[PDB]
Amino acid sequence: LTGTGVLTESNKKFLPFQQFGRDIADTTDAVRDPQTLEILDITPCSFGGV
Amino acid sequence: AYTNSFTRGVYYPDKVFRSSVLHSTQDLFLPFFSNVTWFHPVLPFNDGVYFASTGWIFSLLIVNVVIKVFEYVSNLREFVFKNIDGYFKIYSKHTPILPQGFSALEPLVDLPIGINITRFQTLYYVGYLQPRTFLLKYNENGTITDAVDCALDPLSETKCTLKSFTVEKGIYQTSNFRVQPTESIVRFPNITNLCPFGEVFNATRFASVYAWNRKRISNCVADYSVLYNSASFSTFKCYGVSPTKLNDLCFTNVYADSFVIRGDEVRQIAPGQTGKIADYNYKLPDDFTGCVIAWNSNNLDSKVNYNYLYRLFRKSNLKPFERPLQSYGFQPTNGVGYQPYRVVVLSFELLHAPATVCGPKKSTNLVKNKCVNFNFNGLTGTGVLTESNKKFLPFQQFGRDIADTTDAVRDPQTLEILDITPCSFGGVSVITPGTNTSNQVAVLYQDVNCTEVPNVFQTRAGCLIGAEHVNNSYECDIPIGAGICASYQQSIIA
Amino acid sequence: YFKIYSKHTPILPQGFSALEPLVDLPIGINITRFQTL
Amino acid sequence: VLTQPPSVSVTISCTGSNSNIGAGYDVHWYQQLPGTAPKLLICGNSNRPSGRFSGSKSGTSASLAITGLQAEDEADYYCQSYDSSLSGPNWVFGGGTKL
Amino acid sequence: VQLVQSGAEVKKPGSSVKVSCKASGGIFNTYTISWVRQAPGQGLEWMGRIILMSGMANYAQKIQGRVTITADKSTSTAYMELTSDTAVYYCARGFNGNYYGWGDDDAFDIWGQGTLVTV
Ligand SMILES: *[C@@H]1O[C@H](CO)[C@@H](O)[C@H](O)[C@H]1NC(C)=O
Ligand SMILES: *[C@@H]1O[C@H](CO)[C@@H](O)[C@H](O)[C@H]1NC(C)=O
Ligand SMILES: *[C@@H]1O[C@H](CO)[C@@H](O)[C@H](O)[C@H]1NC(C)=O
Ligand SMILES: *[C@@H]1O[C@H](CO)[C@@H](O)[C@H](O)[C@H]1NC(C)=O
Ligand SMILES: *[C@@H]1O[C@H](CO)[C@@H](O)[C@H](O)[C@H]1NC(C)=O
Ligand SMILES: *[C@@H]1O[C@H](CO)[C@@H](O)[C@H](O)[C@H]1NC(C)=O
Ligand SMILES: *[C@@H]1O[C@H](CO)[C@@H](O)[C@H](O)[C@H]1NC(C)=O
Ligand SMILES: *[C@@H]1O[C@H](CO)[C@@H](O)[C@H](O)[C@H]1NC(C)=O
Ligand SMILES: *[C@@H]1O[C@H](CO)[C@@H](O)[C@H](O)[C@H]1NC(C)=O
Ligand SMILES: *[C@@H]1O[C@H](CO)[C@@H](O)[C@H](O)[C@H]1NC(C)=O
């Protein structure tokens, strides 16, 4: 499952069978690291008007 | 024996973590409060199966854990078995103690098998899954703590509509109501205009094959039924078209070519054939479209008959449809290939002109005061047909309203005028007191008569079912419309 | 289709009147000239 | 009745008369395996259904050609044609040849 | 198309038999049903043909007067029945690849299982 952004440690807890999570608008919010199983949050890369 | 699956058979539809969120999903679920077969035996497998107990064979065999078809090796026992796109999915949970209380089943294993199972055996409750929409409530830990079957009843529909497990008092539109057609009718003018086939097939005098005669047939319907079910046709064959489809197509013109030849000569009146008739007297083109009909006409021709002529010599070959000599001399006593056959060839002409020759149009009876699919003399529509009080001019077939929509039609057989009204439809709304006081609702069908909907109060706004009508006025609470309000007392009143 | 429309009234004169259809003939021919007899 | 050789070890002949084969009428061919109904292998002069075979007419005779001693096709082969004599239409099957 | 016939049965000699045949496959290109019999050790014999549309049937002269064929459109069946041998009676549809309908140059392409009748 693809995406782009900044990966940080998550404080969320996934159930043992869950691989990634989604927010209210059904957008990927977090993923599980498939090798060590830590949960990583995905934040957007900053952008905005200048 | 059956039991009540109060709140069971729900599973996590995917591998996605959700938290503190309400989610609407469509998947194969066991409906709430279903009839689950209770065993103390081979079962069907459909879209998916719910199974519970207090090994399996699907040949996919699960024997406690050894799974073989492909091979894989790894209180209330609650399972779900479904298979999609070749994957056999097993869901499972084990709990202490069908019982009450909601619980979702976690995925156990996804098996990439690629097989279609329709039966299974167990070596004990069996339920079935089907496409339904469920609302799921997740907690902070990603666990499903509750669920709503959006198709179970009107309150569940309201909860799904509002994306909430709690409903505030008010009136909400949750779905539409629409009356479906129950029958289908087609109506056409009762036809008397049949093609003069009698002068082709039931005539007394025929031209001989060397100079055959023809009729031009127009402005009629060809009742092919009369010809193919004839009591005496020895052969009947069509080229480019099947006899059973002739009534569904219209030609510009059809022509009936008739002549007399001997019995065994009849196979020459066909495309691709050669011989004394095919080349010298009646040439039948290889691109011929039409039907050839022939029969034994001995009784009306043969004599104890040097009448019909054909040729033995012609300097050059004939081209399609052109029209030295010898007489046949038909005799009452001969073999089947040597008495006379009467032959009629019906050619089918299609060109850049209005079609003129069709088959008869069949009609159904007329249905009134019910929703039907219909077409009157070719113009389609749907709705309820009633007697009209309108008067059409003698040449008018149907009428239209201000928005150029069919309003009425004339019955093509009896010429009465029928109005077309729409099949009722409208929003269906749920009138509910807050969930914090009561969990019962009244349902309003907008602009629907109560007699056509399937404690009923017919109002101007629509048909209100489940609320009772009282003669006491009150300050309004949940407005319905047209001066009517509803509230909760110990039941819902209007 | 050769369409004929027609009406017959007692008595060009003034006054509006529409002509009702008389007959629709499925002929398939192009006419560019005509004669009255 | 159409005349056929009792057996053939190749081609299967079928001889009639000018009232049925020399009449121009189509001669169809069938292969009947023991235990079941006959299967059509030739329609018309030499057309065939899906599923090695050919044939032709000459005078009042006709024949079936089978090429290659494949498997053990020890079927009873029959010819069929329309007969235009007697006092009415009838269809005639040949004596039958064992291959 | 598929043509299903009756199973085997035994009658007393001199009595009558009715053999059914149902063209359950489609019935969309079937205009006529023919009956052919085969005595044990013998070739095949045409007995008759019925045109389903018209209800008319022709028969082999050798059995004329003791055989009838009935076409029941409503069930898509043809009944072959005899009055007063131990042959197998086969049901087959007529077919021609050059034209639709029926004639003299057509052929029996799809055959049923064969119903034997013995005494
Ligand atoms: C990744 O490899 C480590 C060994 O360093 C192993 O302990 C761990 O379980 C593996 N992760 C997965 C998801 O298999
Ligand atoms: C289960 O089936 C019985 C009839 O055997 C019926 O009376 C009962 O109402 C059904 N219950 C449910 C929930 O469908
Ligand atoms: C389902 O059965 C059909 C045969 O009717 C087969 O072709 C298809 O591949 C099967 N489905 C799967 C996922 O294998
Ligand atoms: C969520 O998990 C924590 C353990 O970290 C537990 O204490 C808490 O009760 C759980 N929440 C619910 C609603 O069960
Ligand atoms: C010919 O006339 C007979 C009545 O003698 C009738 O039954 C038959 O249908 C007619 N055939 C045609 C084509 O009109
Ligand atoms: C329909 O048939 C009846 C005979 O019952 C006849 O009187 C009526 O005029 C026919 N209708 C039309 C439109 O021809
Ligand atoms: C709502 O629920 C609370 C209990 O949590 C109850 O005290 C309150 O009276 C209820 N309100 C209404 C209008 O029923
Ligand atoms: C409902 O239909 C009946 C006819 O069965 C009619 O008498 C009644 O007035 C109608 N009521 C409404 C509100 O349309
Ligand atoms: C309202 O009053 C009428 C008499 O005018 C009576 O027939 C009817 O039953 C009453 N309805 C209710 C709900 O009390
Ligand atoms: C009009 O004339 C052309 C020849 O110029 C002809 O092809 C066409 O079909 C005619 N129109 C109609 C309706 O026949």
XYZ file of N, CA, C and O in Angstrom, chain B residues 228-231 234-239 241-244, chain E residues 28 51 53-56 98-105:
112
model
N -47.062 -22.528 -41.989
C -46.178 -23.561 -41.473
C -46.929 -24.691 -40.775
O -46.407 -25.799 -40.673
N -48.165 -24.453 -40.332
C -48.916 -25.534 -39.707
C -49.863 -26.205 -40.701
O -50.776 -26.925 -40.293
N -49.659 -25.973 -42.001
C -50.541 -26.549 -43.008
C -50.589 -28.056 -42.913
O -49.574 -28.721 -42.715
N -51.778 -28.597 -43.111
C -52.023 -30.022 -43.006
C -51.370 -30.828 -44.123
O -51.327 -32.052 -44.039
N -45.316 -30.816 -47.581
C -44.323 -31.878 -47.516
C -42.983 -31.295 -47.138
O -42.183 -31.930 -46.448
N -42.760 -30.064 -47.574
C -41.537 -29.353 -47.268
C -41.799 -27.863 -47.110
O -42.711 -27.296 -47.722
N -40.989 -27.241 -46.271
C -41.054 -25.822 -45.979
C -39.686 -25.398 -45.497
O -39.254 -25.803 -44.413
N -38.989 -24.595 -46.283
C -37.644 -24.216 -45.887
C -37.358 -22.745 -46.168
O -37.697 -22.240 -47.236
N -36.699 -22.067 -45.212
C -36.387 -20.639 -45.312
C -34.884 -20.398 -45.343
O -34.100 -21.049 -44.656
N -34.508 -19.418 -46.157
C -33.127 -19.031 -46.335
C -32.897 -17.609 -45.857
O -33.571 -16.670 -46.288
N -33.439 -16.622 -42.885
C -34.333 -16.373 -41.770
C -34.990 -17.656 -41.276
O -35.354 -18.518 -42.070
N -35.174 -17.758 -39.966
C -35.865 -18.890 -39.359
C -37.384 -18.663 -39.338
O -37.824 -17.598 -38.916
N -38.214 -19.660 -39.711
C -39.671 -19.613 -39.726
C -40.278 -19.056 -38.438
O -41.221 -18.267 -38.474
N -39.678 -19.396 -37.301
C -40.203 -18.985 -36.002
C -39.960 -17.511 -35.677
O -40.508 -16.995 -34.703
N -35.776 -24.782 -30.435
C -35.845 -23.593 -31.277
C -35.529 -23.834 -32.753
O -35.965 -23.071 -33.608
N -44.135 -33.674 -38.399
C -43.782 -32.282 -38.421
C -44.496 -31.677 -37.242
O -45.717 -31.777 -37.119
N -44.966 -28.651 -36.183
C -45.815 -27.498 -36.411
C -47.200 -27.870 -36.915
O -48.212 -27.389 -36.397
N -47.254 -28.712 -37.938
C -48.533 -29.017 -38.554
C -49.269 -30.172 -37.909
O -50.489 -30.276 -38.027
N -48.535 -31.070 -37.262
C -49.135 -32.246 -36.656
C -49.255 -33.402 -37.647
O -49.731 -34.479 -37.291
N -48.823 -33.182 -38.887
C -48.888 -34.223 -39.903
C -47.712 -35.153 -39.808
O -46.607 -34.728 -39.478
N -28.110 -26.101 -44.523
C -28.297 -25.122 -45.586
C -29.547 -24.272 -45.407
O -29.656 -23.198 -46.000
N -30.500 -24.749 -44.620
C -31.761 -24.044 -44.469
C -32.460 -24.367 -43.170
O -32.184 -25.379 -42.532
N -33.407 -23.526 -42.813
C -34.216 -23.750 -41.637
C -35.505 -24.412 -42.062
O -36.023 -24.134 -43.140
N -36.052 -25.268 -41.221
C -37.285 -25.944 -41.587
C -36.999 -27.397 -41.914
O -36.055 -27.984 -41.383
N -37.825 -27.986 -42.766
C -37.750 -29.418 -43.009
C -37.895 -29.765 -44.478
O -38.531 -29.039 -45.246
N -37.344 -30.906 -44.870
C -37.468 -31.324 -46.258
C -37.006 -32.749 -46.481
O -37.045 -33.580 -45.573
N -36.622 -33.046 -47.720
C -36.236 -34.397 -48.103
C -34.736 -34.646 -47.950
O -34.309 -35.757 -47.641
N -33.945 -33.589 -48.112
C -32.483 -33.673 -48.077
C -31.915 -33.384 -46.702
O -30.718 -33.134 -46.558
